[PDB]
Amino acid sequence: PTYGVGHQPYRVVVLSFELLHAPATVCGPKKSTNLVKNKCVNFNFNGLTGTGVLTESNKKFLPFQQFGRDIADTTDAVRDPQTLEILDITPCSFGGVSV
């Protein structure tokens, strides 16, 4: 007990986790809403947030796959963590305007 601070015992807990795209079993306190398809929505799938339209996908995910990524490494497909269905993500609607 008489030791200086730098010579005193310290209890250490190291928490290591994975933030890569994968199925998840540990989650924070967060209430889930219903699933809306075919409308432009903000969405949050297991922490992956974005905006776009959700439609039913024919992509055949393997069971270890939760997300699908496009050429620009943007998520364009997601497995729903409750229904386990595969969903396509498409940007809502946009275009240039000239006056």
């Binding site: 992509k59 796959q65 997300f67 699908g68 990524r69």
Partner: protein
């Protein structure tokens, strides 16, 4: 109990052994990976 005898030869692996590098679905892409 030592009771097994083993013989060995040598062959070619061709292009076997490729595995999925991560858990992300991909399609219509050429993906470069170091592993």
């Amino acid at each position: 109990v030592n009771l097994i005898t083993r013989t060995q030869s040598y062959t070619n692996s061709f292009t076997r052994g490729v595995y999925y590098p991560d858990k992300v679905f991909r399609s219509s892409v050429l993906h470069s990976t170091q592993d």
